Paper text:
The glutaminase domain of T. brucei [name] synthetase, (residues 319–589), following incubation with acivicin, crystallized in space group P212121 with one molecule in the asymmetric unit and diffracted to 2.1 Å resolution. We now report an improved and corrected inhibitor structure with changes to the chirality at one position, the orientation and covalent structure of the isoxazoline moiety, and the location of a chloride ion in an oxyanion binding site that is exploited during catalysis. The corrected orientation of the ligand now results in four out of five functional groups participating in hydrogen bonding interactions directly with the enzyme, the fifth to a water molecule that is then in contact with the enzyme. N2 and O3 accept hydrogen bonds donated by the main chain amides of Leu420 and Gly392 respectively. The C1 carboxylate interacts with solvent, and the side chains of basic residues Arg498 and His549. Stabilization of the oxyanion intermediate formed during the reaction with acivicin, or during catalysis may benefit from the position of the amine and amide groups of Gln423, Arg500 and Tyr501 respectively forming a positively charged environment similar to that observed near the cysteine protease‐like catalytic triad in trypanothione synthetase‐amidase. This site is where chloride binds.
The enzyme, which consists of distinct synthetase and glutaminase domains, is rate limiting in the synthesis of cytosine nucleotides required to maintain RNA and DNA levels. Acivicin, a fermentation product of Streptomyces sviceus, inhibits enzymes like [name] synthetase that catalyze amido transfers from l‐glutamine. The glutaminase domain is dominated by a core β‐sheet of seven strands decorated on one side by six α‐helices, on the other by four helices and two parallel β‐strands.
Numbering used by the authors: 324 to 588
The structure:
């Protein structure tokens, strides 16, 4: 079996929040022919004086996964999940909040900005590594990014390039508001992060980070988009599929061309 730490809430209080995520995991399970054993971990147990107790549980997993979530609850714990993954070379996959915590984690623990956060969780941080873009904001609020958008894979040696069968542009679906702060790209790069996919291949102030990786590690990938929004039993989301492959310690034959479900029509 393949042990994946699912860092968020217990089954009892998750409701139907992870329905589509778990569907996608099931698609991957079938395509790889592996017995998935998800450990549902309460993210709040990964913070505070006793958190080493919870960290030890993550160290026994084959993979560590951080999905999208709501509110600021367990943000520090999700950051700590990304830290364990980065420091122990345990495959990591983050989706939307999962990417943001990878960025925050790295900013605190490698870049050395102890107060690094998203603008969402600490308005008074002097290192808002995740923030609302100026073009998305006004005095009363900001855009809620939904729907499809072109994703430019800009690193040819990346996990993204490989799992999307070397397509330069793919189309994924979104539900987010805050983006990686463009002013800190060099700092993140110096700390080992590879910006592998973006909305704008020129890297302007309007460049929205769609995927980050850590190529020093076997598998560390996190995406802004929600790959579970495009996944079927016969065409599983490549991001989830590659994560589960890595956790299972298995290879996979990627098609010669990216599926039409994730290409521009
Ligand atoms: Cl949570
Ligand atoms: Cl891979
Ligand atoms: Cl967001």
């Amino acid at each position: 079996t393949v042990r994946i730490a699912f860092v968020g809430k217990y089954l009892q209080d998750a409701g139907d929040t992870y329905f589509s995520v778990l569907q996608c995991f099931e698609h991957c399970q079938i395509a790889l022919q592996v017995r998935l054993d998800i450990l549902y971990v309460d993210s709040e147990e990964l913070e505070g004086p006793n958190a080493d107790e919870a960290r030890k549980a993550l160290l026994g997993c084959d993979g560590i996964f951080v999905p999208g979530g709501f509110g600021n609850r367990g943000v520090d714990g999700k950051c700590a999940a990304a830290q364990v993954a980065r420091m122990n070379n345990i495959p990591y996959f983050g989706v939307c909040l999962g990417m943001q915590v990878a960025v925050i984690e790295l900013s605190r623990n490698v870049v050395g900005w102890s107060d690094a956060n998203s603008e969402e969780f600490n308005k008074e941080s002097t290192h808002q590594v995740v923030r609302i873009m100026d073009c998305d904001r006004n005095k009363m609020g900001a855009n809620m990014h939904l729907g499809a958008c072109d994703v430019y894979i800009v690193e040819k040696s990346s996990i993204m390039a490989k799992i999307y069968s070397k397509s330069n542009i793919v189309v994924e679906r979104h539900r987010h508001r805050y983006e990686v702060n463009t002013a800190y790209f060099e700092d993140l790069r110096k700390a080992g992060l590879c910006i592998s996919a973006v909305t704008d291949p020129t890297f302007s102030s309007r460049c929205r980070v769609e995927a980050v990786e850590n190529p020093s590690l076997r598998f560390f990938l996190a995406v802004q988009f929600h790959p579970e929004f495009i996944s079927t039993p016969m065409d599983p989301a490549p991001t989830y599929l590659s994560f589960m492959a890595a956790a299972a310690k298995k290879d996979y034959v990627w098609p010669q061309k990216c599926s039409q479900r994730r290409l521009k029509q």
